[PDB]
């Protein structure tokens with residue numbers, strides 16, 4: 001019974017923000033070797049970048065002068081497709 | 097050589113999307129026990145929830161009737177503090193073909 005050399009680290013689960021890498025070795029000719037077949041380490045500890053997506057422009061409205069508004073969504077993510085902007089919601093009221 | 101009882105799984109590394117929990121044990125009266133002092137299992141494999149944050153309302157503007165608009169930001173995250181709404185950006189501006197034969 002002998003322990004083989006440690007294998008290469010696997011792929012990190014997360015590209016950023018914290019992931020785990022696993023390294024494996026094989027015990028030969030026995031089910032009970034002294035040591036461990038699997039080790040785990042931290043990987044990709046760099047903070048995820050901040051993705052910014054701008055909302056569609058508000059319809060032009062009078063203040064003559066006209067103005068329109070927009071907002072930005074900010075999120076710390078690895079995939080830009082995970083951040084999305086929802087539908088435009090409009091609220092109305094009457095003033096006399 | 098003797099293995100102690102398994103310890104608690106401790107805290108999962110990730111709150112959602114996949115994490116690992118580790119439980120530890122101690123080898124007694126020996127430096128070479130058959131087995132491992134630590135075991136790892138999967139935890140919190142459920143996909144992360146979609147967090148929604150609404151933007152501040154635009155100032156009321158006439159169409160009398162008044163109307164205002166707002167948007168919502170949706171993101172798959174574990175911490176709501178990681179999702180934020182940015183600053184309000186405003187664009188401003190000021191406000192016939194005669195055919196004489």
Ligand SMILES: O=S(=O)(O)OC[C@H]1O[C@@](COS(=O)(=O)O)(O[C@H]2O[C@H](COS(=O)(=O)O)[C@@H](OS(=O)(=O)O)[C@H](OS(=O)(=O)O)[C@H]2OS(=O)(=O)O)[C@@H](OS(=O)(=O)O)[C@@H]1OS(=O)(=O)O
Pocket residue numbers: 050052072074181182183
């Ligand atoms: O030096 S500062 O005090 O200005 O800080 C700059 C960093 O602040 C953020 C996030 O705010 S914080 O969490 O309070 O730190 O953003 C804000 O400032 C930038 C403008 O920087 S500038 O040098 O004055 O040009 C704005 O970017 S921009 O859209 O105007 O182009 C941010 O506007 S936005 O809402 O993100 O669209 C503004 O955000 S906020 O109104 O305070 O919430 C960091 O931006 S972040 O990385 O997107 O969060 C700035 O860091 S950076 O490296 O300078 O971009």
Ligand SMILES: *[C@H]1O[C@H](CO)[C@@H](O)[C@H](O)[C@@H]1O
Pocket residue numbers: 001002003033034035036
């Ligand atoms: C494997 O583990 C260590 C060496 O890495 C020793 O306890 C022994 O060689 C075992 O087979």
Ligand SMILES: *[C@H]1O[C@H](CO)[C@@H](O)[C@H](O)[C@@H]1O
Pocket residue numbers: 004005006025
């Ligand atoms: C792997 O771990 C270390 C090297 O990183 C040594 O104890 C030995 O090479 C083992 O196979």
Ligand SMILES: *[C@H]1O[C@H](CO)[C@@H](O)[C@H](O)[C@@H]1O
Pocket residue numbers: 032097098099129130131132
């Ligand atoms: C501990 O691991 C197992 C028992 O859980 C055996 O290989 C042996 O008792 C070892 O000390």
Ligand SMILES: *[C@H]1O[C@H](CO)[C@@H](O)[C@H](O)[C@@H]1O
Pocket residue numbers: 100101102103
């Ligand atoms: C470890 O595994 C379980 C507890 O997690 C039990 O079979 C026993 O305590 C063992 O040592």
